[PDB]
Design a protein around this ligand. Structure first.
Ligand code: SF4
Ligand SMILES: [Cl-]
Ligand SMILES: [Cl-]
Ligand code: NI
Length: 728
C-alpha cells in the first residue's frame, strides 16, 4: 500500500509552488507553537495526569487515533505526540514536506480543541446550537446510512469567508440541493445566518465554529474509517486510503488566505481531499488537482465536484423550493405553517396503485379541489394523494414499497413536511414555501419525477392526483383502506418458517466491506429500514442489486438458527472472515454490524440477562459503557459474541433472540426506548405469558446505571430472567 502514489504527477521537479509550500511551513510551525504553549500552560495548571478529551466519542482524539493510534486520555499523553509532529515539519520546500506539515497542523488543531474542551461540561457548554464544535459519534452513525448509498454524494468543508453573504447563500443552497454534507468554519457561518439559511445537525450542515474548530471536520471524517470500516487505530495509510476512496470530501477555501488556514487545507490534501479557493492564484501557489483557484462563484461548486469526482443526479423539474436530504429533518412550527392536511385535523390518505395500460396518461398531475391559496395562513384542507402506476414489469407487491417512498419524497422539499402513512398521514407546508410559489401541483410533479427517477425499470407511466374536497377524500379513503387491508393480510402470512428464502443486504459494504446483513421475515435489518418484503422487492426490481435471495437449506442448528446456505453466502460475501451465523442468538456466532444499528444489546452475566441501548440515549448503561463506546466494539463487521446490533422493531419480533430466551431475558432498556415500543412489548409479553405488565419489570436509567443499583430492583420485581439459566 503506497498511498502517496496518488500525488505522483501533481508537481514535476523544479516548478514546486514555493509560495504555497512556504506559507504551509509557516502555518504549521505557528499551529504547533500555539498548541505547545497552550499544552504547557494547561499541564502547569491542571497537572500532567488531568483527563482530556471530547464529549461522546469512542475514539479519544480521532485524528490521532486514526493516523497514529495513540489512546490520548490525559494531557501528558499529548506531549510526545506534539513533539513528534513538530519534528516532522521541515524547511525544504517539497510537496511531501508540505503534506507532513499539514498532518502536523491537523494534530495541533486536534490538541488545541481537546484543550478547549477541558472547560466543557454538558451543563457549562462551550458551544451552543446551531453550532456543533466537536460532533459526537451518534451523529456520524445517524448519517452513515445516507452516506453508504450516496444519498449524501460527498462532503464540502468550507472555511473562511464568502465574498459576501449573498454569494455564501447561493453556493450553500446549491450544495444543500445536491445533498452534500457541509462542514462550515469561520465567518461563512454568520454570513449564512444573516441570510436565514437553515443550519445545524438536523440539516446536515454543521457550523463547527472558527479557527481550529475546522479540525472537527477531520475527526468526523476519520471516524468513518474507525467505525464502519473497522480499520485498526494507527494504520495511517489504510485510513488515508479509506478517506480517499470513500469519503468524497473537498475543501472550499474562501476569502483572504492566512498561513494557518493554508496549512489546515494542506492537511486535507495530505489525506486526499482537494482544495478549491475563490482567490486568484499565481502559478507558484497552486497544485494541479489539489490546490486550485476558481474565482467565479458561478463555477466553484461544479469545479470542486468535478475535481473530487462527485457525480450528482438531479430530477431537473423547476421546483420553486429547494429540495434535498438536508430538509428531511426540518420541522415546521405552527407560526411558520401556511397550511396542513391530515394529522387528525382534516381527512387524509396516500396510495400507490398499479394500473393497466388503458388507464393512465404519463406525467399527468391534477389537483381536484381548492389549492392551498384557498386558505388563510395557518389553515387546513383535506388531502388524498393517488399515484397510479402502470409498468410492464410492475407488480402489485411493489405498491406498498413505492408508497413508503412518498414520505421521504415529501420531506426532502424545503418547507414540505410529512409524517405517518396510509390514512394517518400528516402533511404541512410552510409560509416560506408558499411565498416562493409552491402549490399542490408542485408536490405532485415532485412525486412524479422522483418515482420516475427511482424506479425506471418498473414504472413506464405514472400519474398523480391530489383531491382536496372533504367528502370525496372521505369516499376515496375507503378504497385506500381496502388496499391497506389486503397488504396487512399478505404481511400476516409471513414467518421465518413459512418462507423458504431469506435475503442478503450488502448496501453497507461501500463503507463496511466485511459486513453482511441477512433479513428474514421476523428479523428486520439492523438499520431498521429494510424488511424482508423490502429486500425481496428490491431484488425483484434489480436482480443484480445488493439484495439477493438465499434459500433456507443445509440446516445445522434449528434452535440457534444456523444453515449451511447462509453460512456459505456470508463467508463468500464477508471476504472469508465470517464463517458462521446463528440467527436466534447473540451469544454464539452473532450476525455482524456495520455501524448504523438503531440499538445495541449486550449480555450482562451479573443480571443474568440483556441490556439494550438505542443510539439516541445519552447516559451510562449497566455494562459500564455508553452507546458510543459499545458501538465502537459492536460495529466494524467483526463477530462479537455477547453483543449485537439490531433494529428497534426487532425487539417486538416473535423470533427476537429466541434461542436466548427472547423478551423474557431483557432486564434493562432506556425509559424512552421502552415507551417507544410499549405497545408491541405489551402484546408480545402477553403472548409469551409474561403478562402485559412485564414492561414494568424491565429496569431503566431511572432505576440505575450500574449492576449494583439494578439487581435489587429485578429481585424485588421477581424478574423471570433471574430464575432462567445463565446464558454463558
Ligand atoms: S439491511 Fe443491513 S446492510 Fe442493508 S442498509 Fe440496513 S444495515 Fe445496511
Ligand atoms: Cl513553552
Ligand atoms: Cl497514549
Ligand atoms: Ni451500520
Amino acid at each position: 500500500i503506497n498511498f502517496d502514489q496518488i500525488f505522483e504527477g501533481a508537481i514535476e521537479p523544479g516548478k514546486e509552488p514555493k509560495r504555497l509550500f512556504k506559507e504551509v511551513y509557516e502555518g504549521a510551525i505557528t499551529a504547533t507553537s500555539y498548541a505547545e504553549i497552550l499544552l504547557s500552560r494547561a499541564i502547569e495548571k491542571y497537572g500532567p495526569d488531568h483527563p482530556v478529551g471530547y464529549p461522546d466519542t469512542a475514539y479519544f482524539l480521532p485524528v490521532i487515533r486514526a493516523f497514529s493510534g495513540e489512546e490520548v486520555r490525559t494531557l501528558k499523553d499529548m506531549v510526545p505526540i506534539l513533539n513528534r509532529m513538530r519534528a516532522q515539519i521541515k524547511s525544504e520546500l517539497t510537496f511531501e514536506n508540505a503534506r507532513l506539515a499539514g498532518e502536523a497542523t491537523w494534530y495541533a488543531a486536534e490538541i488545541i480543541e481537546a484543550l478547549r474542551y477541558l472547560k466543557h461540561t454538558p451543563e457549562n457548554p462551550i458551544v451552543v446550537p446551531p453550532w456543533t464544535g466537536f460532533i459526537g459519534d451518534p451523529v456520524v452513525r445517524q448519517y452513515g446510512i445516507k452516506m453508504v448509498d450516496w444519498t449524501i454524494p460527498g462532503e464540502a468543508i468550507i472555511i473562511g469567508r464568502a465574498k459576501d453573504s449573498k454569494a455564501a447563500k447561493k453556493i450553500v443552497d446549491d450544495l444543500m440541493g445536491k445533498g452534500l454534507m457541509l462542514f462550515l468554519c469561520d465567518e461563512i457561518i454568520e454570513q449564512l445566518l444573516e441570510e436565514n439559511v437553515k443550519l445545524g445537525v438536523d440539516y446536515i450542515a454543521y457550523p463547527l465554529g472558527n479557527f481550529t474548530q475546522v479540525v472537527h471536520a477531520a475527526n468526523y471524517a476519520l471516524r468513518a474509517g474507525l467505525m464502519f470500516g473497522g480499520i485498526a487505530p494507527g494504520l495511517r495509510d489504510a485510513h488515508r486510503d479509506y478517506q480517499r476512496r470513500r469519503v468524497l470530501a473537498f475543501v472550499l477555501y474562501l476569502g483572504e488566505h492566512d498561513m494557518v488556514k493554508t496549512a489546515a487545507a494542506m492537511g486535507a490534501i495530505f489525506t486526499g481531499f482537494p482544495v478549491i479557493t475563490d482567490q486568484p492564484l499565481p502559478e507558484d501557489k497552486q497544485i494541479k488537482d489539489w490546490f486550485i483557484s476558481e474565482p467565479d462563484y458561478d463555477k466553484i461548486v461544479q469545479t470542486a465536484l468535478e475535481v473530487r469526482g462527485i457525480k450528482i443526479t438531479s430530477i431537473d423539474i423547476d421546483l420553486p423550493i429547494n429540495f434535498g436530504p438536508a430538509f428531511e429533518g426540518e420541522s415546521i412550527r405552527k407560526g411558520d405553517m401556511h397550511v396542513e392536511f391530515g394529522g387528525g385535523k382534516t381527512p387524509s390518505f396516500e396510495l400507490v396503485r398499479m394500473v393497466g395500460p388503458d388507464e393512465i396518461e404519463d406525467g399527468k398531475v391534477e389537483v381536484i379541489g381548492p389549492d392551498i391559496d384557498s386558505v388563510e395562513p395557518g389553515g387546513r384542507l383535506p388531502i388524498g394523494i393517488v399515484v397510479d402506476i402502470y409498468g410492464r414489469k410492475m407488480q402489485e407487491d411493489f405498491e406498498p414499497v413505492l408508497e413508503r417512498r412518498i414520505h421521504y419524497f415529501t420531506n426532502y422539499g424545503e418547507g414540505f413536511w410529512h409524517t405517518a402513512q396510509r390514512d394517518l398521514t400528516w402533511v404541512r407546508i410552510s409560509k416560506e414555501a408558499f411565498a416562493k410559489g409552491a402549490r399542490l401541483k408542485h408536490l405532485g410533479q415532485l412525486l412524479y419525477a422522483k418515482f420516475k427517477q427511482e424506479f425506471p425499470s418498473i414504472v413506464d407511466r405514472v400519474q398523480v392526483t391530489i383531491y382536496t374536497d372533504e367528502q370525496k377524500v372521505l369516499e376515496l379513503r375507503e378504497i385506500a383502506r381496502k388496499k391497506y387491508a389486503e397488504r396487512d393480510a399478505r404481511l400476516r402470512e409471513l414467518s421465518d418458517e413459512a418462507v423458504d428464502t431469506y435475503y442478503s443486504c450488502l448496501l453497507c459494504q461501500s463503507f463496511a466491506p466485511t459486513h453482511v446483513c441477512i433479513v428474514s421475515p421476523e428479523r428486520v435489518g439492523l438499520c431498521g429500514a429494510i424488511s424482508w418484503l423490502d429486500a425481496k422487492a428490491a431484488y425483484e426490481i434489480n436482480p443484480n442489486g445488493p439484495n439477493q435471495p438465499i434459500p433456507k437449506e443445509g440446516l445445522i442448528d434449528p434452535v440457534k438458527g444456523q444453515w449451511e446456505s447462509f453460512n456459505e453466502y456470508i463467508y463468500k460475501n464477508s471476504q472469508r472472515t465470517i464463517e458462521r451465523m446463528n440467527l436466534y442468538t447473540i451469544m454464539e456466532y452473532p450476525m455482524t454490524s456495520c455501524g448504523c444499528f438503531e440499538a445495541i444489546m449486550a449480555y450482562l452475566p451479573e443480571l443474568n440477562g440483556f441490556m439494550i441501548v438505542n443510539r439516541e440515549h445519552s447516559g451510562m448503561t449497566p455494562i459500564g459503557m455508553t452507546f458510543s463506546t459499545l458501538a465502537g466494539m459492536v460495529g466494524g463487521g467483526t463477530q462479537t459474541p455477547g453483543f449485537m446490533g439490531i433494529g428497534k422493531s426487532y425487539i417486538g419480533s416473535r423470533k427476537f433472540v429466541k434461542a436466548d430466551g427472547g423478551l423474557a431475558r431483557v432486564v434493562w432498556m432506556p425509559k424512552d426506548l421502552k415507551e417507544q415500543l410499549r405497545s408491541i412489548i405489551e402484546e408480545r409479553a402477553e403472548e409469551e405469558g409474561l403478562g402485559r405488565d412485564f414492561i414494568d419489570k424491565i429496569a431503566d436509567e431511572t432505576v440505575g446505571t450500574t449492576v449494583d443499583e439494578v439487581l435489587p430492583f429485578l429481585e424485588e420485581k421477581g424478574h423471570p430472567a433471574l430464575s432462567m439459566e445463565p446464558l454463558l
